[PDB]
Scaffold this active site. Structure first.
Site, PDB file in Angstrom:
ATOM      1  CD  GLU A  55     135.216 -26.153 126.578  1.00 26.23           C
ATOM      2  OE1 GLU A  55     136.021 -26.799 127.077  1.00 26.23           O
ATOM      3  OE2 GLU A  55     134.173 -25.830 126.958  1.00 26.23           O
ATOM      4  CG  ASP A  57     130.286 -26.018 133.702  1.00 29.05           C
ATOM      5  OD1 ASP A  57     131.721 -26.252 133.830  1.00 29.05           O
ATOM      6  OD2 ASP A  57     129.472 -26.328 134.513  1.00 29.05           O
ATOM      7  CG  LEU A  83     134.880 -22.389 136.531  1.00 23.36           C
ATOM      8  CD1 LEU A  83     133.348 -22.910 136.404  1.00 23.36           C
ATOM      9  CD2 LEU A  83     135.702 -23.115 137.412  1.00 23.36           C
ATOM     10  CG  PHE A 129     140.942 -25.392 127.826  1.00 23.05           C
ATOM     11  CD1 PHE A 129     139.347 -25.522 127.818  1.00 23.05           C
ATOM     12  CD2 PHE A 129     141.456 -24.418 127.396  1.00 23.05           C
ATOM     13  CE1 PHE A 129     138.792 -24.303 127.541  1.00 23.05           C
ATOM     14  CE2 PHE A 129     140.764 -22.984 127.213  1.00 23.05           C
ATOM     15  CZ  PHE A 129     139.521 -23.097 127.331  1.00 23.05           C
ATOM     16  CB  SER A 169     145.170 -42.687 130.333  1.00 25.94           C
ATOM     17  OG  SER A 169     143.934 -43.339 130.452  1.00 25.94           O
ATOM     18  CG  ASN A 182     142.857 -46.659 131.249  1.00 29.41           C
ATOM     19  OD1 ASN A 182     143.121 -45.633 131.819  1.00 29.41           O
ATOM     20  ND2 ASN A 182     142.548 -47.649 131.936  1.00 29.41           N
TER      21      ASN A 182
END
Length: 164
Positions: free
Chosen positions: A11, A20, A32, A104, A117, A132
């Site tokens: 990040e 972002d 965020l 996250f 998945s 996948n």
């Protein structure tokens, strides 16, 4: 390597409000603030989150506090979610971190949507699951990060991050 270091790599750290990858107002380590187009809305959320008048800027310590909160909230979210919990419980230590990374980034709800998945990881079909996962908007939008994550699930090691 641990979950914090891993997310700090993915990040970055920014002490001033920024947009972002999706254009949203964010601060610190991927925190965020608002999906709203209003910078003011953002600055408002920031002050509320920090507890002070920040005028769009925070300290390292403040970024880290938000980070601590976010990671905690991510783990707790997984643990409370009926679709995620069993996957998490079935995984080894490294792969657990990887699932946390996804949550996250995309929220509980977002990851819980990756039905097929999730099932493959549960079954420990690593290769199948990697392929996948790659078939998603997520992968197409942030391919270098998605590849690190996918490789991590694939091998169950931190090689993808030992580079970086």
């Amino acid at each position: 390597m641990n979950i914090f270091e891993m997310l700090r790599i993915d990040e970055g750290l920014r002490l001033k409000i920024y947009k972002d990858t999706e254009g949203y107002y964010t601060i610190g380590i991927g925190h965020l603030l608002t999906k709203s187009p209003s910078l003011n809305a953002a600055k408002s959320e920031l002050d509320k989150a920090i507890g002070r008048n920040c005028n769009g800027v925070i300290t390292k310590d403040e970024a880290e506090k938000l980070f601590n909160q976010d990671v905690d909230a991510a783990v707790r979210g997984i643990l409370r979610n009926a679709k995620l919990k069993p996957v998490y419980d079935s995984l080894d230590a490294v792969r657990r971190c990887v699932l946390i990374n996804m949550v996250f980034q995309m929220g509980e709800t977002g990851v819980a949507g990756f039905t097929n998945s999730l099932r493959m990881l549960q079954q420990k079909r690593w290769d199948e699951a990697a392929v996948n996962l790659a078939k998603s908007r997520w992968y197409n939008q942030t391919p270098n990060r998605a590849k690190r994550v996918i490789t991590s699930f694939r091998t169950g090691t931190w090689d993808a991050y030992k580079n970086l």
